[PDB]
């Protein structure tokens, strides 16, 4: 189960630095990576990066190496295996090329070869 509701579809103008939220429910927020992948209108789907809500470790794409700031606040425990965390992501020198729908997805597993694979996607926030 689980649902990763995203922020609002707010659109600004070039030069801005919009922040996109992604709060989770129904699963252990610290047990899986969070992942952000956009779908540019004039490009193929582009993977941006994942961060570990537990270790606090980040790994992003070269096209977003010094352009994206993504963070996560700690989880609010609900039961032994349910938490309510949140994931935020910003962009630096945003232009009209970054126009498109943005997604947040959680990791596939918590060990092995495909640990961080974006398995459970959110809802999507439409940008400029």
């Amino acid at each position: 189960q689980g649902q990763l509701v995203q922020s609002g579809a707010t659109t600004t103008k070039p030069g801005s630095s919009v922040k996109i939220s992604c709060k989770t429910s129904g699963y252990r927020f610290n047990f899986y990576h969070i992942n952000w992948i956009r779908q540019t209108a004039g490009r193929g789907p582009e993977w941006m990066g994942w961060i570990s809500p537990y270790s606090g470790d980040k790994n992003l794409a070269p096209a977003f190496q010094d352009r994206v700031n993504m963070t996560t606040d700690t989880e609010v425990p609900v039961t032994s295996f349910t938490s309510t965390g949140a994931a935020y992501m910003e962009i630096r020198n945003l232009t009209s090329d970054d126009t498109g729908t943005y997604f947040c997805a959680k990791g596939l597993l918590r060990d092995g070869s495909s640990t961080w694979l974006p398995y459970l996607w959110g809802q999507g926030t439409l940008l400029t």
Binding site: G44, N59, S113, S114, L117, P118, W121, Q123
Partner: protein, 105 residues
Amino acid sequence: VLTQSASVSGSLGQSVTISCTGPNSVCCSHKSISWYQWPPGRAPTLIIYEDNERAPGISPRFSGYKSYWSAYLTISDLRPEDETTYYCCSYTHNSGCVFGTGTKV
């Protein structure tokens, strides 16, 4: 940098095969290949991870394969709802998905 099939399609009862190949920096005999059923703009779906492993809940019709230079995605026994787009990932254990050009059906 990761090319796929231009386009393919079939009828209810047959099967397809969406290719996914590329240069030595993205494919294949040293990276894992995953497959997503991704309708454009909407919430996608993980259908295959690391070459041929099926995600939980996936019907046993989505069979995967990977030779030393290309990975295939067979969608045997087609359904009306299978007609969307498909992209393939290129990833290891400590990296990121390198998506492909996509292939509609």
